[PDB]
Design an enzyme around this catalytic site. Structure first.
Site, PDB file in Angstrom:
ATOM      1  N   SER A  32     -52.126  78.143 -11.014  1.00 17.61           N
ATOM      2  CA  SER A  32     -51.767  76.738 -11.195  1.00 17.61           C
ATOM      3  C   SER A  32     -52.899  75.907 -11.783  1.00 17.61           C
ATOM      4  O   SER A  32     -54.045  75.998 -11.336  1.00 17.61           O
ATOM      5  CB  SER A  32     -51.333  76.142  -9.850  1.00 17.61           C
ATOM      6  OG  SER A  32     -51.480  74.740  -9.845  1.00 17.61           O
ATOM      7  N   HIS A  63     -41.873  73.886 -19.694  1.00 13.55           N
ATOM      8  CA  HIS A  63     -43.133  73.266 -20.132  1.00 13.55           C
ATOM      9  C   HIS A  63     -44.333  74.242 -20.128  1.00 13.55           C
ATOM     10  O   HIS A  63     -45.501  73.816 -20.164  1.00 13.55           O
ATOM     11  CB  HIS A  63     -43.441  71.980 -19.325  1.00 13.55           C
ATOM     12  CG  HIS A  63     -43.452  72.169 -17.837  1.00 13.55           C
ATOM     13  ND1 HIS A  63     -44.615  72.319 -17.107  1.00 13.55           N
ATOM     14  CD2 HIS A  63     -42.438  72.214 -16.934  1.00 13.55           C
ATOM     15  CE1 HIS A  63     -44.319  72.447 -15.823  1.00 13.55           C
ATOM     16  NE2 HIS A  63     -43.005  72.387 -15.695  1.00 13.55           N
ATOM     17  N   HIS A  85     -43.768  83.372  -9.037  1.00 10.60           N
ATOM     18  CA  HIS A  85     -43.977  83.306  -7.592  1.00 10.60           C
ATOM     19  C   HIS A  85     -42.706  83.684  -6.825  1.00 10.60           C
ATOM     20  O   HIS A  85     -41.591  83.532  -7.337  1.00 10.60           O
ATOM     21  CB  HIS A  85     -44.294  81.871  -7.137  1.00 10.60           C
ATOM     22  CG  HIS A  85     -45.467  81.241  -7.793  1.00 10.60           C
ATOM     23  ND1 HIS A  85     -45.532  81.028  -9.147  1.00 10.60           N
ATOM     24  CD2 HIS A  85     -46.605  80.722  -7.273  1.00 10.60           C
ATOM     25  CE1 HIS A  85     -46.663  80.404  -9.439  1.00 10.60           C
ATOM     26  NE2 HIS A  85     -47.332  80.205  -8.317  1.00 10.60           N
ATOM     27  N   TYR A  87     -41.515  81.969  -4.142  1.00  5.89           N
ATOM     28  CA  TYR A  87     -40.719  80.738  -4.004  1.00  5.89           C
ATOM     29  C   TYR A  87     -39.748  80.417  -5.125  1.00  5.89           C
ATOM     30  O   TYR A  87     -38.711  79.850  -4.870  1.00  5.89           O
ATOM     31  CB  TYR A  87     -41.567  79.487  -3.720  1.00  5.89           C
ATOM     32  CG  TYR A  87     -42.660  79.141  -4.715  1.00  5.89           C
ATOM     33  CD1 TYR A  87     -43.978  79.401  -4.403  1.00  5.89           C
ATOM     34  CD2 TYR A  87     -42.393  78.472  -5.900  1.00  5.89           C
ATOM     35  CE1 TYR A  87     -44.989  79.013  -5.216  1.00  5.89           C
ATOM     36  CE2 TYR A  87     -43.420  78.073  -6.741  1.00  5.89           C
ATOM     37  CZ  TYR A  87     -44.721  78.348  -6.386  1.00  5.89           C
ATOM     38  OH  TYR A  87     -45.808  77.981  -7.169  1.00  5.89           O
ATOM     39  N   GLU A  88     -40.054  80.792  -6.362  1.00  8.10           N
ATOM     40  CA  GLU A  88     -39.140  80.469  -7.465  1.00  8.10           C
ATOM     41  C   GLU A  88     -37.844  81.269  -7.314  1.00  8.10           C
ATOM     42  O   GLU A  88     -36.839  80.969  -7.948  1.00  8.10           O
ATOM     43  CB  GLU A  88     -39.814  80.719  -8.824  1.00  8.10           C
ATOM     44  CG  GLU A  88     -40.743  79.588  -9.312  1.00  8.10           C
ATOM     45  CD  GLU A  88     -41.712  80.022 -10.431  1.00  8.10           C
ATOM     46  OE1 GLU A  88     -41.400  79.882 -11.644  1.00  8.10           O
ATOM     47  OE2 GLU A  88     -42.819  80.485 -10.089  1.00  8.10           O
ATOM     48  N   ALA A 115     -54.678  78.791  -7.247  1.00  8.15           N
ATOM     49  CA  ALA A 115     -55.127  77.549  -6.656  1.00  8.15           C
ATOM     50  C   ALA A 115     -54.778  77.737  -5.191  1.00  8.15           C
ATOM     51  O   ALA A 115     -53.621  77.961  -4.837  1.00  8.15           O
ATOM     52  CB  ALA A 115     -54.367  76.407  -7.240  1.00  8.15           C
ATOM     53  N   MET A 218     -49.861  81.158  -2.581  1.00  7.26           N
ATOM     54  CA  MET A 218     -48.512  81.644  -2.599  1.00  7.26           C
ATOM     55  C   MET A 218     -48.340  82.578  -3.756  1.00  7.26           C
ATOM     56  O   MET A 218     -47.262  82.646  -4.354  1.00  7.26           O
ATOM     57  CB  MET A 218     -47.580  80.447  -2.728  1.00  7.26           C
ATOM     58  CG  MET A 218     -47.845  79.332  -1.712  1.00  7.26           C
ATOM     59  SD  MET A 218     -46.625  78.014  -1.882  1.00  7.26           S
ATOM     60  CE  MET A 218     -47.042  76.929  -0.386  1.00  7.26           C
ATOM     61  N   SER A 219     -49.397  83.316  -4.073  1.00  2.00           N
ATOM     62  CA  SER A 219     -49.336  84.234  -5.184  1.00  2.00           C
ATOM     63  C   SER A 219     -50.476  85.215  -5.110  1.00  2.00           C
ATOM     64  O   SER A 219     -51.083  85.381  -4.058  1.00  2.00           O
ATOM     65  CB  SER A 219     -49.432  83.448  -6.480  1.00  2.00           C
ATOM     66  OG  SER A 219     -50.631  82.692  -6.526  1.00  2.00           O
ATOM     67  N   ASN A 242     -57.547  71.996  -2.135  1.00  2.00           N
ATOM     68  CA  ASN A 242     -57.347  71.045  -1.052  1.00  2.00           C
ATOM     69  C   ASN A 242     -57.642  71.642   0.301  1.00  2.00           C
ATOM     70  O   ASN A 242     -57.328  72.791   0.532  1.00  2.00           O
ATOM     71  CB  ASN A 242     -55.899  70.503  -1.070  1.00  2.00           C
ATOM     72  CG  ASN A 242     -54.850  71.538  -0.600  1.00  2.00           C
ATOM     73  OD1 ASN A 242     -54.457  72.438  -1.349  1.00  2.00           O
ATOM     74  ND2 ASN A 242     -54.366  71.371   0.632  1.00  2.00           N
ATOM     75  N   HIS A 256     -48.807  69.024  -3.939  1.00  2.00           N
ATOM     76  CA  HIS A 256     -49.053  69.943  -5.063  1.00  2.00           C
ATOM     77  C   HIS A 256     -48.935  69.079  -6.266  1.00  2.00           C
ATOM     78  O   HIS A 256     -49.461  69.391  -7.335  1.00  2.00           O
ATOM     79  CB  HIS A 256     -47.974  71.005  -5.218  1.00  2.00           C
ATOM     80  CG  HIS A 256     -47.654  71.304  -6.648  1.00  2.00           C
ATOM     81  ND1 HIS A 256     -48.360  72.215  -7.396  1.00  2.00           N
ATOM     82  CD2 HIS A 256     -46.779  70.716  -7.506  1.00  2.00           C
ATOM     83  CE1 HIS A 256     -47.948  72.172  -8.650  1.00  2.00           C
ATOM     84  NE2 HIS A 256     -46.989  71.269  -8.743  1.00  2.00           N
TER      85      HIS A 256
HETATM   86  N1  LIG Z   1     -49.478  77.639   0.760  1.00  2.00           N
HETATM   87  C1  LIG Z   1     -50.344  76.892   0.056  1.00  2.00           C
HETATM   88  N2  LIG Z   1     -50.377  77.045  -1.264  1.00  2.00           N
HETATM   89  C2  LIG Z   1     -51.268  76.209  -1.837  1.00  2.00           C
HETATM   90  C3  LIG Z   1     -52.090  75.273  -1.232  1.00  2.00           C
HETATM   91  N3  LIG Z   1     -52.889  74.599  -2.120  1.00  2.00           N
HETATM   92  C4  LIG Z   1     -52.559  75.082  -3.350  1.00  2.00           C
HETATM   93  N4  LIG Z   1     -51.578  76.044  -3.159  1.00  2.00           N
HETATM   94  C5  LIG Z   1     -51.003  76.753  -4.356  1.00  2.00           C
HETATM   95  O1  LIG Z   1     -50.578  75.731  -5.306  1.00  2.00           O
HETATM   96  C6  LIG Z   1     -49.139  75.784  -5.530  1.00  2.00           C
HETATM   97  C7  LIG Z   1     -48.568  74.697  -4.620  1.00  2.00           C
HETATM   98  O2  LIG Z   1     -49.210  73.451  -5.035  1.00  2.00           O
HETATM   99  C8  LIG Z   1     -48.646  77.238  -5.254  1.00  2.00           C
HETATM  100  C9  LIG Z   1     -49.808  77.791  -4.274  1.00  2.00           C
HETATM  101  O3  LIG Z   1     -50.280  79.078  -4.792  1.00  2.00           O
HETATM  102  C10 LIG Z   1     -52.058  75.113   0.139  1.00  2.00           C
HETATM  103  O4  LIG Z   1     -52.747  74.288   0.804  1.00  2.00           O
HETATM  104  N5  LIG Z   1     -51.126  75.983   0.746  1.00  2.00           N
END
Ligand SMILES: Nc1nc2c(ncn2[C@@H]2O[C@H](CO)C[C@H]2O)c(=O)[nH]1
Ligand SMILES: Nc1nc2c(ncn2[C@@H]2O[C@H](CO)C[C@H]2O)c(=O)[nH]1
Ligand SMILES: Nc1nc2c(ncn2[C@@H]2O[C@H](CO)C[C@H]2O)c(=O)[nH]1
Lengths: 288, 288, 288
Positions: A32, A63, A85, A87-88, A115, A218-219, A242, A256
């Site tokens: 990301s 995009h 991912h 989730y998609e 990220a 998440m990846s 974050n 996000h």
């Molecule tokens: N689960 C999780 N994914 C995060 C976090 N920060 C960034 N992410 C990542 O960014 C995207 C969601 O914005 C998909 C995930 O890979 C977080 O605090 N938790």
């Protein structure tokens, strides 16, 4: 495994080959926000997933979602801008389809970026965390890319992961960071994959911290898994976008739709970090 | 549950019955490598899964996968050589199909064996760990064999598992071990199921150790679950085939394609352990 | 998400609207046994799921499963008697279908109740535990209701959950409890969802206690997730129907087929607790 057959991979890779004169050695997967890394490639040849044979097309987001073949600091790359991912909705065998194609393309190194939110308190948003290891939470329940009959043409039934993230590459990334005079040290930790699109809750955040994770994302993990399964040298990193909230006093809330951190300070710091590393990836020629 | 209906089970069990004069009491499930236990049965009648009606056929491996009816040390058995696993791709309702057939065949005891890696450091490869309990990681996420509408003809909607592994049988196995003058004591612990075919990573290994597991495997639990759901007395054990790597200094790497441990020292030690236990399984006749 | 399209929700909600003159503000979801709360509604209008357009019908149990529109202590409610669970076999997008319908019906508050076993020892069967937070174990593996492409018409791709259970509502429930002169204090903790229909084993029970959960159940979390995803104010509680067994000396064994606790002491104590709270739910009119 599942849904795709060896032939499929073989055909996608071949069509790719017969459509680009670049024979990539390193395949980089941009997490990301970290997508503009593609901008710094030379002799760039772009293919949007869609036009590539058995290639999973990106969901709604029209995009982005492209495969950029090029040269980065001397290395012939292939960058996947915009990973897939869970989730998609994609079955992991789709999420990781490109990793097997890369293997058939000749790629011997895969560097995955992502990220991640930070569970370890020493981390600070903006920090880059070298992945020393992962905890594949989905894989525990059965959400493993290798599930289904194993194709000995790619690898073992039961591949080992104790050695996933290359020990050498990590050594070098650390040094490379020092020889960039950075001040804020390259962090090192364990990335924990969580599937669902929603963000952690404080309790969830705390179990992840207790479990031993340093960053939660998440990846990445499905890709690392199938890369390693077919032999690819894997090295990857997390951009702490974050600090995940560990207190009920919270006040702040995970967002996000604030993919800032990545495009902010990181955008550069990281894409240049990646370039010098190309130099540190051993040439399939090397010798002395 | 799901995919199969009561009729299906009823038909497989009946066809079985009308194809073997053996009416088995104890059903043994042989874990990786522990398969030759079938060799020591008498009046052996072999059926390869394939020829049995609604019986899940084994994946690619055409080098095993059979149901051997016989007599072991006085008990009329039914041994499943080569269990089914999630990693092979089977929905748990298939993995555990045989357990319900056994129930309809009259089986009142199920002893499940498996090859597990060791998380508890006191264990040594070769050690046999009596399963005192399990942690069904997949079941937490929803990967439970009982999922779907519950057939009151087999059991409860919400069966209890606090009592899975028979307390009596365990008592006896311990004594039986002593009266074999073994030296290396029968271990006892908690088996944790992990689905995915790949092996644990050090971080994963550490969360499992923290979670309370003593051995980690990729089977048994779905079977125990549906056995207990339909009343079967369950007793089972793990053969510690390898100490899972808990340190980054690792050096060593997990290998299955080294199903040695099981065929090595274990091969015998364990199959004889199993035989004397037949004696300790109470006869459906017993009385005094 | 998945299986249902925005239109579907839109049609179910509209048909509902054009079939009841009640425009509900608060949607209450009755957990196991806590169903008679519907009995105390006024101007009650009952719809059995079955007759409602795209509404998931309850499995085998033809002894309940209805949506009761009414008035409870001044508030216009909509109560779902008999929630849907993963164990019954429903994909989470079905389990949570009603939560999105409620949103389209105008509901701005969702109060979810459930019957949970207790992991925290201070709890006593009969105790009511206000949910301060949850741990969505299935969601870690991918069992998340938001999985699949995200409909921006309901919410965000990545909704945050650090703030799930309304901080205000909780404040009030506590006070409301005091002004009922109860003696046994309203408990507060973290609910952990576990999917599978079977009950925890002692080892499982212990990992849940270590993970930080106070109560373990098999519902609520998917609903809270999609409620929060579409903005609903969520407040919910657990009725400790049984202390989950944390010792091997056990003796006792978990039973659901003993949905007593809920219908016992709780039946009243809780349904009256719920009524006074209606008063504490801010009117979409309110102002001063
Ligand atoms: N689960 C999780 N994914 C995060 C976090 N920060 C960034 N992410 C990542 O960014 C995207 C969601 O914005 C998909 C995930 O890979 C977080 O605090 N938790
Ligand atoms: N997950 C896991 N399974 C193991 C381990 N050792 C043996 N196993 C078991 O053997 C097979 C893989 O070789 C399937 C699994 O039941 C181990 O260390 N980890
Ligand atoms: N997993 C679990 N669910 C429980 C427990 N006690 C009550 N429950 C709840 O009641 C039903 C089963 O009776 C469904 C589940 O939400 C418990 O101890 N464990």
């Amino acid at each position: 495994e599942n849904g795709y057959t060896y032939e499929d991979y073989k055909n996608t890779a071949e069509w790719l080959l017969s459509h680009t004169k670049h024979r990539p050695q390193v395949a980089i997967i941009c997490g990301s926000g970290l997508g503009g890394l593609t901008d710094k490639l030379t002799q760039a040849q772009i293919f949007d997933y869609s036009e590539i044979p058995n290639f999973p097309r990106s969901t709604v987001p029209g995009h982005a979602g492209r495969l950029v073949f090029g040269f980065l600091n001397g290395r012939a790359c292939v960058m996947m801008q915009g990973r897939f991912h869970m989730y998609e909705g994609y079955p992991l065998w789709k999420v990781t389809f490109p990793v097997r194609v890369f293997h058939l393309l000749g790629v011997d190194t895969l560097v995955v970026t992502n990220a991640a939110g930070g569970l370890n308190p020493k981390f600070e948003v903006g920090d880059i965390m070298l992945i020393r290891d992962h905890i594949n939470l989905p894989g525990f329940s059965g959400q493993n890319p290798l599930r289904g009959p194993n194709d000995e043409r790619f690898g073992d039934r039961f591949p080992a992961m104790s050695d996933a993230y290359d020990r050498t590459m990590r050594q070098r990334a650390l040094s490379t960071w020092k020889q960039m005079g950075e001040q804020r040290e390259l962090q090192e930790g364990t990335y924990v994959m969580v599937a669902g699109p929603s963000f952690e809750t404080v309790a969830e955040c705390r179990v992840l911290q207790k479990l031993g994770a340093d960053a939660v994302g998440m990846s990445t993990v499905p890709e690392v898994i199938v890369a390693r399964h077919c032999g690819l040298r894997v090295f990857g990193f997390s951009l702490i976008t974050n600090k995940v909230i560990m207190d009920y006093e919270s006040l702040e809330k995970a967002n996000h739709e604030e993919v800032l951190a990545a495009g902010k300070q990181a955008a550069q710091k990281l894409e240049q970090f990646v370039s010098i590393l190309m130099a540190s990836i051993p040439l399939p020629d090397k010798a002395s």
